[PDB]
Amino acid sequence: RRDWENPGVTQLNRLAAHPPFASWRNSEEARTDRPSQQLRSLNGEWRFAWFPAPEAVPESWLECDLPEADTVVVPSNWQMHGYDAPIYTNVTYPITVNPPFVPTENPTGCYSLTFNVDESWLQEGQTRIIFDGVNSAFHLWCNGRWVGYGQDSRLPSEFDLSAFLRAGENRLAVMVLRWSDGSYLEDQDMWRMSGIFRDVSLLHKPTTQISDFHVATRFNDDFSRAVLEAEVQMCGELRDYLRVTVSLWQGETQVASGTAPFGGEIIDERGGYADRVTLRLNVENPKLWSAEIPNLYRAVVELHTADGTLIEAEACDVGFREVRIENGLLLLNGKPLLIRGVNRHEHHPLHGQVMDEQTMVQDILLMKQNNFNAVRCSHYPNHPLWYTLCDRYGLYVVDEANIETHGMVPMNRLTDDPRWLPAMSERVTRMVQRDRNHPSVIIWSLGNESGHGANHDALYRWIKSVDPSRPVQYEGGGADTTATDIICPMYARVDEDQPFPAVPKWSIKKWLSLPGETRPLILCEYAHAAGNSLGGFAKYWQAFRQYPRLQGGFVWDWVDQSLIKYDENGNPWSAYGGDFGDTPNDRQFCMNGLVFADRTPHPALTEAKHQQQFFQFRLSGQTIEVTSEYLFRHSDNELLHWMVALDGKPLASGEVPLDVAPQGKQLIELPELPQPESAGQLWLTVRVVQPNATAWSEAGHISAWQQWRLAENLSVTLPAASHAIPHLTTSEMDFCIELGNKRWQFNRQSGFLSQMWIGDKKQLLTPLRDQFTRAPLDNDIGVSEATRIDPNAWVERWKAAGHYQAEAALLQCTADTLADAVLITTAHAWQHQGKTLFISRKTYRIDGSGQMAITVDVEVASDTPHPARIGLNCQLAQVAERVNWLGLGPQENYPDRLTAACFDRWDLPLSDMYTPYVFPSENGLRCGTRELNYGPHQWRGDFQFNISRYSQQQLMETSHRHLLHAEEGTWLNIDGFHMGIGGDDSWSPSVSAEFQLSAGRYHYQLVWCQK
Amino acid sequence: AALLQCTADTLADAVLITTAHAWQHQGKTLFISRKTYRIDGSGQMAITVDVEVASDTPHPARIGLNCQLAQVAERVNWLGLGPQENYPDRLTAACFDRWDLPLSDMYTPYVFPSENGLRCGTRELNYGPHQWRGDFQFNISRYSQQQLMETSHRHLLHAEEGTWLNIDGFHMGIGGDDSWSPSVSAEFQLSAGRYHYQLVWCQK
Ligand SMILES: O=C1O[C@H](CO)[C@H](O)[C@H](O)[C@H]1O
Ligand SMILES: [Mg+2]
Ligand SMILES: [Mg+2]
Ligand code: NA
Ligand code: NA
Ligand code: NA
Ligand code: NA
């Protein structure tokens, strides 16, 4: 019947969806959430065999293990074991678009397991098997007998095996299909894999059982009083002696308990539900749940007899919180939320899409440590443990249905088709039935990029009807359709409108006030962190803080989707689209995370942490005003450390305890600061430190910081006259300046300083020349599809203008001797096919003190695309271990992404001055630098710089970081100016006007000398 | 202005004058101006100005040069934004072109006297035998900035001997969102800390 090519059949013999069950036969264990003997894991070693199509599977496999099969670990994606290649494609379906058909060559994975089952499980009750995740469709057999079928890769499929099992040894046989009609609803921009990638278990339930239960919590006006309501449903034979007891616990203290026989209130003309009962428990002064303080209670649902015999128990963590939209604002416990969130895919560099507790916890810790309080399940229901962790650690979750049909034309072709309503409804309804009891889930999502169809409006209302406790959102069709309670655009800009036809992305500030609009606005996706990105991030947060209805958003995204591969030497390297022979593919577009696949931070993470701080500061005189953005907690684990320094040198510091109420302010007056010893700029730096450790952080964790320029004393003291005078040696091909053991050689043909000698040691490997280009960042290249070549992308404009090909032409090179120095004057014109792109005029002044002052004045043709940078570069013959500088740091920072950086004296090993982006590009820059020290060299002025063993040329021509090779010496790039990196999105020019080098005329001056 | 440095150097085809000043008050150095005047064999004086402004002093109204020329001409010819008065935050209406107006039109008769008549984005200015080139803002009239701020009514102003010229590399916005509180937007305040501008003064 080829059930995998029929959207009308999404499952066969599958049991109803429901909340997590464990079937405890001991209440104490249900209360403490301890392991349950009635819930067995079948994870471990299984037998697996790969076939090109389901037609190639031998019938023998159904009742006997195939000798050709291997023993593999489950859960797992078979591509990760090497049976076939994982495919990375963004929008374009990996299969021919011809719904509901899939290729005849359909990779088939045949799993089998021989396991034991005790007669005690078969003599009484029900024994069911549970597959938390199978990609993307499968048929189940038990002891050679066909059991059922299932679809939807991100929700569990359960089947009753009570009639197929036998005492002793049993054998399962699962035929998993890579492609099915369900694949048409799973076109998310991520690796395309398959297999039994989530847990498999066996659950025993009594015949008379708790089949479902819903927990709700409503409050009075000030939340000082609450009522917990628990509806419980049963299956089996109804008896007058059956009872249901629901008890609520706060730690070891039982707070409330209620018992009642089955039989619900009258529903309609035919009566009520005799197989259901609702318990209502009163709770005074409940400890409220929030991401700030994840207070949790434990609800225990007991099914028992009047005489006191327990039949079974279920339970869940309960969080007392209310979520509602009122007067245009998303409120939590009556307070307007400010969503500091991020999108997070279930990705592991080695295991693929198999999630483990360790990785989940690591992500959560890093998230909260970096001031995030929310996560969006892009774009499907997550591993069940995820919700438990967000419940306990405290993170707001947007639970999203596994529905994305991005590759359709138009996007809503399937979702506006009633023939697909069934398949869609199951992805939404089964998600709600599974996760509705988790307090962490505060918003439901109908899926992602499936345009907007009538099926969306239908399912939108279904959720509103069955679960009024959570708002529903969906971005397809314009981000503001009738299928969403929240305006949730993706990559809508802060001030700039993008009037696309039919589905415009208005600037978020303008979106809010459109005629008749009243809903709150939270971007489901923004600040695309692909590579060297997050430029302009601060602009979003200034807006979020000023506009009440702009309530944040979810950064895209958390972690790069790179996979581990091994080279000839067997060493691991990070791969992306196309590295597995997968084609078509969208290359590096799968890496858009704030952290690398191994969870190592990208520089952008710190910019995020800074902007998302929960404490805001203002300086007036010597008074620091600290405002709290927390909505529920007082700052009872915060200490403010302040430090004043004169250009890096510490002059004074202290620490004051913070005691600010949520939404409150605290005034802190700094003691009279001693007068700076010399000239320079005083800088005030304050940091909020958490003295005590928490569930998500260690003692001494820094949660917020800010800097301010205080008094400055301009140096009016002119240096002493030098002893010796530099000597000029004019030759036909060179202008050589001599001063003691030092020598500067300027080539008269090129007009560039080609070499420097300190004694007999050459200082340069490459001449000091102007540079107006950079190894293009992901945002410069701007393609979300490898097949598309955007001529409007910055890199194409630069290439087309000849910026990368431009040749310097000497216009002038003269030398002059002054009273105490030698003045070299130069002028170069950079041209491309007759067009003069840039003109650089310089003067080099080498005085008796051995300093070479370099003054640069550049002209940029107003009609050529604004240059990526304006500076100089050279290859220093030396390679030192450290880099020391006075400026912004310690991490990499660009013009539109430097708010998190602080002005101070920084010292790091040379390696840290290079950011290992998987896709190489310009990186490691540090801005606002007044002094740079490397080996014997020292550069002064006001510039931006990067330094490493990789020339811009190699970075630009190398596709993977692991293929880079340390060049001889050290490449230095010092820019008087540098263009912004952008990032609002990575498929169109995103660098804001203020960060484009459009001034036409630029001036900067550097001083090069010996340290 | 406290003189920090004043030197002279003879080059191949030019004389170089280097200077450094520090404007202070109550022992506080407010600004520091470093310049070089390069007069070559063609009679052109290239002036390069680099100024430092203490970060803790209120941003200055302008960063430029001024002098009182002895000559009094009838016309003012310039290549820049015009023909009317325009300031950094009020120049969208002005157009770049060759403008030529009588001296009187370069003065805006506000009843209450103040800085007036500025014209921005000027690459060339001509007055009498003089010509200034670069990329500056300027106002030119028979009234000094001093007289303007000391005189309450326009009818009390008296033409001073010669002509007062104010060539600025940078000028603060004029604001106006209201007239009873600071209203000059941030992007129009001279807060860069270090400013650079150059001019070429010659005869025509
Ligand atoms: O709009 C989007 O942008 C991202 C680009 O990396 C990613 O494809 C998301 O899944 C999609 O919703
Ligand atoms: Mg089907
Ligand atoms: Mg997509
Ligand atoms: Na807001
Ligand atoms: Na992507
Ligand atoms: Na505190
Ligand atoms: Na590259």
Ligand code: NA
């Ligand atoms: Na006046």
